[PDB]
Enzyme design. Structure first.
Site, PDB file in Angstrom:
ATOM      1  N   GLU B  46       0.800  -1.210   0.000  1.00 30.91           N
ATOM      2  CA  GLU B  46       0.000   0.000   0.000  1.00 30.91           C
ATOM      3  C   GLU B  46       0.844   1.275   0.000  1.00 30.91           C
ATOM      4  OE1 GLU B  46      -3.555  -1.089   0.404  1.00 30.91           O
ATOM      5  OE2 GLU B  46      -3.501   0.636  -0.954  1.00 30.91           O
ATOM      6  N   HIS B  83       5.151   0.105  16.854  1.00 23.69           N
ATOM      7  CA  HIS B  83       5.401   0.495  18.235  1.00 23.69           C
ATOM      8  C   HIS B  83       4.311   1.258  18.970  1.00 23.69           C
ATOM      9  CE1 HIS B  83       9.840  -0.474  18.081  1.00 23.69           C
ATOM     10  NE2 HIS B  83       9.529  -0.460  16.798  1.00 23.69           N
TER      11      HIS B  83
END
Lengths: 58, 84, 86
Positions: B46, B83
Protein backbone atom coordinates in the site's frame (compact mmCIF):
# COMPACT_ATOMS: atom_id res chain seq x y z
CA UNK A 1 -27.15 -9.73 12.27
CA UNK A 2 -24.36 -7.18 11.63
CA UNK A 3 -24.85 -3.76 10.03
CA UNK A 4 -24.12 -3.73 6.30
CA UNK A 5 -20.61 -2.66 5.32
CA UNK A 6 -21.07 -3.42 1.66
CA UNK A 7 -23.60 -2.68 -1.07
CA UNK A 8 -23.57 -3.07 -4.82
CA UNK A 9 -23.60 -0.05 -7.12
CA UNK A 10 -26.92 -1.24 -8.57
CA UNK A 11 -28.55 -1.25 -5.15
CA UNK A 12 -26.78 1.95 -4.11
CA UNK A 13 -28.36 3.88 -7.01
CA UNK A 14 -31.77 3.55 -5.41
CA UNK A 15 -30.72 3.56 -1.75
CA UNK A 16 -27.98 6.20 -1.76
CA UNK A 17 -29.61 8.44 0.87
CA UNK A 18 -30.16 5.59 3.32
CA UNK A 19 -26.62 4.39 2.62
CA UNK A 20 -25.19 7.83 3.40
CA UNK A 21 -27.17 7.95 6.64
CA UNK A 22 -25.79 4.56 7.67
CA UNK A 23 -22.15 5.52 7.08
CA UNK A 24 -22.74 8.63 9.20
CA UNK A 25 -24.71 6.76 11.90
CA UNK A 26 -22.09 4.09 12.56
CA UNK A 27 -19.20 6.44 11.85
CA UNK A 28 -17.88 3.61 9.69
CA UNK A 29 -17.20 3.43 5.93
CA UNK A 30 -19.41 1.54 3.49
CA UNK A 31 -17.96 -0.16 0.44
CA UNK A 32 -19.83 0.23 -2.84
CA UNK A 33 -18.87 -2.71 -5.05
CA UNK A 34 -18.94 -2.71 -8.85
CA UNK A 35 -19.59 -5.84 -10.92
CA UNK A 36 -17.11 -4.68 -13.56
CA UNK A 37 -15.35 -1.49 -12.50
CA UNK A 38 -13.61 -0.53 -9.28
CA UNK A 39 -15.31 -0.20 -5.91
CA UNK A 40 -15.60 3.04 -3.98
CA UNK A 41 -15.93 3.87 -0.30
CA UNK A 42 -18.49 6.21 1.23
CA UNK A 43 -17.85 7.74 4.65
CA UNK A 44 -18.95 10.75 6.68
CA UNK A 45 -17.06 14.00 6.13
CA UNK A 46 -16.24 13.92 9.84
CA UNK A 47 -14.60 10.50 9.55
CA UNK A 48 -12.79 11.63 6.41
CA UNK A 49 -11.26 14.73 8.03
CA UNK A 50 -10.31 12.86 11.19
CA UNK A 51 -8.51 10.36 8.98
CA UNK A 52 -6.61 13.08 7.12
CA UNK A 53 -5.72 14.89 10.35
CA UNK A 54 -4.09 11.67 11.53
CA UNK A 55 -2.22 10.99 8.28
CA UNK A 56 -1.03 14.60 8.58
CA UNK A 57 0.47 14.14 12.05
CA UNK A 58 -1.99 16.67 13.50
CA UNK B 1 18.55 -4.25 -5.34
CA UNK B 2 20.40 -3.16 -2.20
CA UNK B 3 19.01 -3.24 1.34
CA UNK B 4 19.44 -0.03 3.32
CA UNK B 5 18.17 0.20 6.90
CA UNK B 6 17.80 2.98 9.42
CA UNK B 7 18.81 2.44 13.04
CA UNK B 8 15.11 2.14 13.83
CA UNK B 9 14.41 -0.60 11.28
CA UNK B 10 17.69 -2.32 12.02
CA UNK B 11 16.87 -2.49 15.71
CA UNK B 12 13.37 -3.73 14.78
CA UNK B 13 14.87 -6.47 12.60
CA UNK B 14 17.36 -7.64 15.23
CA UNK B 15 14.66 -7.54 17.89
CA UNK B 16 12.74 -10.14 15.91
CA UNK B 17 16.01 -11.94 15.24
CA UNK B 18 16.44 -12.54 18.97
CA UNK B 19 12.72 -12.68 19.82
CA UNK B 20 10.63 -14.53 17.24
CA UNK B 21 12.29 -16.31 14.32
CA UNK B 22 8.84 -16.96 12.85
CA UNK B 23 8.43 -13.22 12.29
CA UNK B 24 11.94 -13.05 10.83
CA UNK B 25 11.04 -15.50 8.08
CA UNK B 26 7.94 -13.47 7.24
CA UNK B 27 9.98 -10.27 6.95
CA UNK B 28 12.55 -11.97 4.69
CA UNK B 29 9.79 -13.33 2.44
CA UNK B 30 8.31 -9.86 2.11
CA UNK B 31 11.70 -8.29 1.39
CA UNK B 32 12.48 -10.94 -1.21
CA UNK B 33 9.08 -10.40 -2.81
CA UNK B 34 9.30 -6.60 -2.78
CA UNK B 35 12.80 -6.96 -4.21
CA UNK B 36 11.24 -8.87 -7.09
CA UNK B 37 8.16 -6.66 -7.44
CA UNK B 38 8.55 -3.41 -5.40
CA UNK B 39 4.95 -2.27 -5.82
CA UNK B 40 3.05 -5.57 -6.05
CA UNK B 41 2.73 -8.98 -4.43
CA UNK B 42 2.62 -10.32 -0.88
CA UNK B 43 1.49 -8.34 2.14
CA UNK B 44 -1.05 -6.24 0.29
CA UNK B 45 1.40 -3.45 -0.72
CA UNK B 46 0.00 0.00 0.00
CA UNK B 47 1.30 3.46 -1.03
CA UNK B 48 1.40 6.02 1.80
CA UNK B 49 0.23 9.64 1.82
CA UNK B 50 1.19 13.13 3.01
CA UNK B 51 4.29 13.22 5.21
CA UNK B 52 4.78 9.54 4.26
CA UNK B 53 4.53 10.13 0.50
CA UNK B 54 6.92 7.94 -1.42
CA UNK B 55 6.81 5.14 1.11
CA UNK B 56 4.93 1.85 1.02
CA UNK B 57 3.54 -0.59 3.58
CA UNK B 58 3.18 -4.38 3.59
CA UNK B 59 1.66 -6.71 6.18
CA UNK B 60 4.01 -8.76 8.37
CA UNK B 61 1.10 -9.45 10.77
CA UNK B 62 -2.21 -7.66 11.31
CA UNK B 63 -0.16 -5.40 13.54
CA UNK B 64 3.39 -5.19 12.17
CA UNK B 65 4.20 -3.59 8.83
CA UNK B 66 7.24 -3.52 6.58
CA UNK B 67 7.47 0.17 5.64
CA UNK B 68 9.78 1.07 2.75
CA UNK B 69 10.62 3.31 -0.20
CA UNK B 70 12.31 2.54 -3.51
CA UNK B 71 15.02 4.51 -5.31
CA UNK B 72 16.43 3.87 -8.77
CA UNK B 73 19.07 1.81 -6.97
CA UNK B 74 17.85 0.25 -3.72
CA UNK B 75 15.22 -0.62 -1.12
CA UNK B 76 14.98 1.71 1.88
CA UNK B 77 13.53 -0.07 4.92
CA UNK B 78 11.86 2.38 7.30
CA UNK B 79 10.41 -0.24 9.65
CA UNK B 80 9.52 -3.87 10.33
CA UNK B 81 7.81 -3.55 13.73
CA UNK B 82 4.85 -1.46 15.01
CA UNK B 83 5.40 0.50 18.24
CA UNK B 84 3.21 1.64 21.11
CA UNK C 1 -13.68 24.26 5.24
CA UNK C 2 -13.51 21.26 2.85
CA UNK C 3 -11.05 21.39 -0.03
CA UNK C 4 -12.65 18.94 -2.40
CA UNK C 5 -15.05 18.93 -5.28
CA UNK C 6 -18.68 18.92 -4.20
CA UNK C 7 -21.69 17.39 -5.93
CA UNK C 8 -25.37 17.45 -4.98
CA UNK C 9 -27.13 14.34 -3.74
CA UNK C 10 -29.37 14.35 -6.82
CA UNK C 11 -26.58 14.74 -9.38
CA UNK C 12 -24.54 12.00 -7.70
CA UNK C 13 -27.51 9.66 -7.49
CA UNK C 14 -28.52 10.31 -11.09
CA UNK C 15 -24.90 9.82 -12.21
CA UNK C 16 -23.53 7.39 -9.62
CA UNK C 17 -21.66 5.26 -12.15
CA UNK C 18 -19.85 8.22 -13.71
CA UNK C 19 -19.14 9.69 -10.27
CA UNK C 20 -17.52 6.49 -9.03
CA UNK C 21 -15.53 6.05 -12.24
CA UNK C 22 -14.14 9.60 -12.01
CA UNK C 23 -13.19 9.11 -8.36
CA UNK C 24 -11.30 5.97 -9.38
CA UNK C 25 -9.72 7.54 -12.48
CA UNK C 26 -8.63 10.76 -10.79
CA UNK C 27 -7.72 9.26 -7.42
CA UNK C 28 -9.58 12.18 -5.93
CA UNK C 29 -12.42 12.31 -3.36
CA UNK C 30 -15.77 14.02 -3.86
CA UNK C 31 -18.21 15.39 -1.29
CA UNK C 32 -21.88 14.46 -1.75
CA UNK C 33 -24.22 16.87 0.02
CA UNK C 34 -27.93 16.48 0.75
CA UNK C 35 -30.06 19.63 0.69
CA UNK C 36 -30.80 18.89 4.33
CA UNK C 37 -27.21 18.93 5.53
CA UNK C 38 -26.05 15.30 5.45
CA UNK C 39 -22.72 14.96 3.63
CA UNK C 40 -20.45 12.04 2.81
CA UNK C 41 -17.18 11.75 0.95
CA UNK C 42 -16.93 9.18 -1.83
CA UNK C 43 -13.48 7.93 -2.82
CA UNK C 44 -11.98 5.00 -4.68
CA UNK C 45 -11.21 1.88 -2.62
CA UNK C 46 -7.57 2.30 -3.60
CA UNK C 47 -7.42 5.84 -2.24
CA UNK C 48 -9.28 4.82 0.90
CA UNK C 49 -6.89 1.94 1.61
CA UNK C 50 -3.93 4.29 1.14
CA UNK C 51 -5.29 6.94 3.50
CA UNK C 52 -6.33 4.40 6.15
CA UNK C 53 -2.96 2.62 6.15
CA UNK C 54 -1.19 5.99 6.50
CA UNK C 55 -3.34 7.03 9.42
CA UNK C 56 -2.79 3.60 10.98
CA UNK C 57 1.00 3.98 10.97
CA UNK C 58 0.80 7.43 12.55
CA UNK C 59 -2.04 6.81 14.99
CA UNK C 60 0.38 5.49 17.62
CA UNK C 61 2.60 8.38 18.84
CA UNK C 62 5.48 6.01 19.58
CA UNK C 63 5.34 4.51 16.09
CA UNK C 64 4.88 7.87 14.35
CA UNK C 65 7.97 9.22 16.10
CA UNK C 66 10.20 6.27 15.12
CA UNK C 67 8.89 6.15 11.59
CA UNK C 68 9.51 9.88 11.16
CA UNK C 69 13.08 9.66 12.48
CA UNK C 70 13.64 6.57 10.33
CA UNK C 71 12.31 8.23 7.14
CA UNK C 72 14.31 11.39 7.88
CA UNK C 73 17.55 9.42 8.10
CA UNK C 74 16.81 7.35 4.99
CA UNK C 75 16.01 10.38 2.85
CA UNK C 76 19.27 11.94 4.06
CA UNK C 77 21.26 8.98 2.75
CA UNK C 78 22.37 8.17 6.30
CA UNK C 79 21.05 4.63 5.88
CA UNK C 80 23.28 1.60 6.42
CA UNK C 81 23.36 -1.31 3.96
CA UNK C 82 22.92 -4.76 5.53
CA UNK C 83 21.83 -8.13 4.16
CA UNK C 84 19.05 -10.31 5.56
CA UNK C 85 20.00 -12.61 8.43
CA UNK C 86 18.78 -15.90 6.97
Amino acid sequence: GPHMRTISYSEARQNLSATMMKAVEDHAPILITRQNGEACVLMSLEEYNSLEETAYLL
Amino acid sequence: MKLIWSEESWDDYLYWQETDKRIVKKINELIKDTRRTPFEGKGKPEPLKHNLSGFWSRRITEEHRLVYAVTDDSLLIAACRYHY
